[PDB]
Symmetry: D4
Subunit: 201 residues, 8 copies
């Protein structure tokens, strides 16, 4: 497993002239206003990953932000509701072309109530996915391998979920959900993170 670790930003976009990029983050916690972004991981789907350590107070990451802003490149997340929020809060750019494996699982794997990444990878790919101070100056090898494992499989999952969405004729539902997901993340940032805006009560 080749994992390239960077400080601050990608050196260039030579490895990311592609149609879709897998994205994940690590933070100090679940609350973007308190808990800073510490790591961003990326994969092109070729079995390699980039792990970018984000410094305290860092406001810019131009190569990463070009990827996040490029409307011709789909950003793949698992539970992108969180990653979109923390990315937009940190760098000021909200991606608007996204695919979320958690929404896709809820729209296709209707025979189960377990939609976590480990269960999805286990069922769909027979891949076994295995408290950490992500703000440490030097990440451990175990940390780097764990961080990389979260992006290595998202392309294959997206392909399978696209097949299932076509099979059950739910493609337009998923498309509308993905179109709204960035605004759901914005609603989280604005103060409605605990509110289902569509519920009767």
């Amino acid at each position: 497993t080749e994992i390239r670790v960077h400080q601050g930003d990608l050196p260039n976009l030579d490895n990311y002239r592609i149609d879709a990029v897998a994205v994940d983050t690590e933070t100090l916690g679940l609350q973007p206003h308190r808990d800073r972004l510490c790591v961003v991981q990326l994969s092109s789907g070729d079995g390699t990953a980039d792990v970018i350590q984000i410094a305290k107070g860092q406001k810019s990451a131009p190569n990463l932000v070009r990827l996040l802003s490029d409307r011709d490149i789909t950003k793949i997340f698992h539970f992108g509701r969180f990653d979109l929020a923390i990315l937009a809060h940190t760098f000021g750019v909200m991606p608007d072309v996204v695919f979320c494996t958690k929404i896709a699982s809820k729209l296709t794997r209707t025979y189960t109530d377990r939609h976590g990444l480990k269960e999805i990878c286990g069922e769909l790919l027979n891949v076994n996915i295995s408290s950490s101070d992500w703000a440490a100056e030097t990440l451990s090898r175990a940390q780097i391998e764990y961080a990389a494992s979260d992006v290595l499989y998202l392309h294959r999952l997206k392909d399978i979920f696209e097949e299932r969405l076509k099979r059950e004729e739910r493609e337009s539902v998923a498309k509308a959900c993905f179109q709204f997901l960035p605004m759901r993340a914005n609603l989280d940032l604005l103060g409605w993170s605990e509110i289902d805006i569509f519920a009767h009560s």
Copy 2:
């Protein structure tokens, strides 16, 4: 209060050459697959209302459906999530240009947890809004007046909510919510009515 009661459909659209129409429904209950649409009420905002009794098994309402399908006319609902679902289930057309006073209340009246129509009308307009077999062949006068009261005030509420959304700079949030609302209703019809599709669990 002039309330025009119709059987099946509007006679024509002479009163609805307008930019926005207030819409509400009455049904036999909260479950569109079991509980049929019984009444549709409309208002142009001029203080009059149309009350249309829908027959059992009725599949078409061409004048009403032209209004529901006309993209140049905004359909105003209170909690349109339900009305859109029952309308689409009954006539096969899902409106796609909508405004919902419940979403607007949740985005602007942040100082309260009561977002029902009675409280909104009381606070914003000083208007007092006051178990019924809506499938009865002949509706009572009390039924007709109650049914009309649900559409008589939606234009004024929409105007006030638009002022507040501009004041708090939440117009684009509301616009995205309204754009997604028809798909939220479709999700309800397809079997996800009890599921928040965006929740982590």
Copy 3:
């Protein structure tokens, strides 16, 4: 309101050569093994009622039991699940031709969650229904009038519910529910009173 009060049993069946009889009970509480039957009230639907005081330890009531056993006479209850249980526990005969207004309400009044007798009488008939030691040797006038009020309206409710069941095409569902209701009461007597026998868990 003519209310005839009896000790032990009806004097004869001269007033009950009819197709359906309204039945209700009063007890010392909700648990038939602890809380004895104290009063049985009956009505033919003609606006009069019979109120029969049941003695402690009384094992037989032949005229009443003939009515309860007569398969040609429908016994009308509101929430007959309880009355059937206490009657069978007290006199050893379980009626098997019954109509229950609570089951009928749950099958027809789908637009509300309030299925109590007061709400049903209020909505369907515009009739206002208004801690009591029912084992007292002499019942008060208020007790007698309250006891009679529970049977005076069941015939009219049954007629309306039959119309609604026909309208919504749920007659065979109701018939099967009424056929099972005596066994639901037996299940209560045998020790499953707190168990939904059909639930997955």
Copy 4:
């Protein structure tokens, strides 16, 4: 273990000239209106099973439906409330001569609160019973063996439960429950799937 896999329907009824047949299903989920029937498994009790893959949109299965409709053949289920609902929804025929091992367990194994098939098979027979896309065009061997395991033991369980029902004198209770079970399934299909129709509230 001989397991015969069929497409669409049984080829004939040569193996099912018997008094009782074990039946189970697999689906895309718990909601019959959204989640289609994918597999039906059958056993005569001789240690072999038939596994029938049901196609999307399939409306007819004449040999299977003859079995389901034959009043001289008892259909054995575990939690037949679900299987009856999905079968009736798919093929339009509701079986009316049934035996359910879950109801039988709740009526006889009163010393435990675990009524699942694994626990019943473990206790009564010392047999160890061990997220799956059941709509796959080709089922895996593990899927076929799991699907067969759900019907291989129902005859032996029915025999034991009949002995216990006789011992505790609960045969007529069980008979009435089995007679009502198809209507409980119909109630589920009609929209009362979340409602205990016999509860006070």
Copy 5:
């Protein structure tokens, strides 16, 4: 209503040469270790009451304590579990001949779940019973009348409850409950106030 207000103790026992005395207390709250006893009220059942203000730090009340210790005089409480605890904590003597109207209500008024003193007095006697700093140096007239109202009716209630306990043949159950009640209060003082000592868990 003659209400005699005393400081510290009764002047003598001339009014309490009787077989049963009604007793109640007022405190600064529900926790005897934190919230001191402020008032003790007594009645002989003759329609008069004694209201004794207890000083901060007061350790002795000899006339009162003689009454509390006299085994020939039954102490009547409503929910004596609390009063016994606070009395024993304050003066070091636990009464051991008691009658509690709350236990009696739970053993006889099985047709209701409301066992408060107001409901009992309303049902059994047609008597209407109507945040207060009970440690105030001078009690208000409203305070004195309220304090007296809690003891004026306990004799009549005890008489009625004794009749009902005889009628339902529960006298020995009640006697055993009253015998254990002082130890239940001791258990409260020792630290088990939140624990049902007889529960399985």
Copy 6:
């Protein structure tokens, strides 16, 4: 381990001329009115046990009942609240000299919330205690050994608990609890099994 299995009753009391006997039961479930007594196990504390199979409908067991009635012999239970109830319901005699290890645990092992027999035996004695049709005509060896294991250790536990009750000065509390326990069991039989008779609500 010598375990003597008997039908109906002990042959004689030659092994039970002792000051305390360990007692346990097995039944068809937790509800004495529905679930019959199937087995009674006894031990003198000498490392042997007697296992008595009780027949359906058996009304008498004279040697056992002499033991249960002998006021000079303490009956030791773990959670005697249940065993006393089922014994009194079956044979008509309620023991009145008892010791309960569950009450004792709750009064002494205040540093834990786990008061089950396995945990008590593990902590106090370093003894490892390891769905069963107890009404079977022939009990299995595993059943007999399990049934015996529930009485083999109660004498040693009683001795230790008596030491702890003396150490923490809670002997009189325990004595009062044991004196009330038979009436708690009677309250269960009379219909208050789900009610804490001493609670405020």
Copy 7:
């Protein structure tokens, strides 16, 4: 009632050369990061009040901030946990000499669970205290009178609570609570608003 309404800030501090000032706020909601401060009300305790409308985006209020920063002047709040948070978030200064009537009520009115301002004013002073867009450009007379009513009584309450704290010897407890309250508010601002920092879990 003289109520002086100001825009932005007090004109001067001529009325506030005093030892204690009553303070309250109004906002657009309970979440300081989303819901802006709209009104600040002040009283010297002389029966008059100042009502200061705060503009959107206003960052400074020098006279008000001098009062908030003056360590020689005690700021009286009811539930100051919120007001301190919103004031510090808006103007950047956290008061550090405070008195809170809610903490005082919880430390002294131990005989009740209702600690709201209405109940406190009703009990202690016999004063009757009687959804509002507080961001409106012009406040209504009803709004102004309601806003003033929240500060008119805090001095009298503080005096009474100081008497009670002295009486029950809880002065040092209250002093430590008031000393920590500003840091509790800071914890709210930093992201622990939903966390009891002292709880075990």
Copy 8:
């Protein structure tokens, strides 16, 4: 591991001329008014521990109390809220210079909800931490080693937590929390142990 076991008190303070001491206790339970202090364990951080058995009724421990009272020595606890309460209740001295690893964890390990000592030691130090009658006259070796394990690591944890508090700029928050913690313990002793004194309700 050198563990020195003492009766009553330390023999002298020769090993505790240090700036910080790790402290833990063992008791008979969670309620200081009922459950006595049984053991106090101390460590200087040098890998050795002192285990002091406290006798029933012991009121004084002069060397220990000098340590607890010495304002120049920081007392380190894990969840000191409890230990401070039981120590103050037993010896009458409340320490006022403290550090709590549970508060520190809640202020720094924001990426997890598990703040127990085992998880903290596992994550921060890679140290594996592994129902007991602590009032026994002779403690077992397993008891002594377990008791010592609770203090052996608190110095190292305090050092790491101080680094993290500096990194996230939360030092003054923690300092204020530690300053209030002794009064939180006093509030527990006075009767508010179940009350969050800062909550709105």
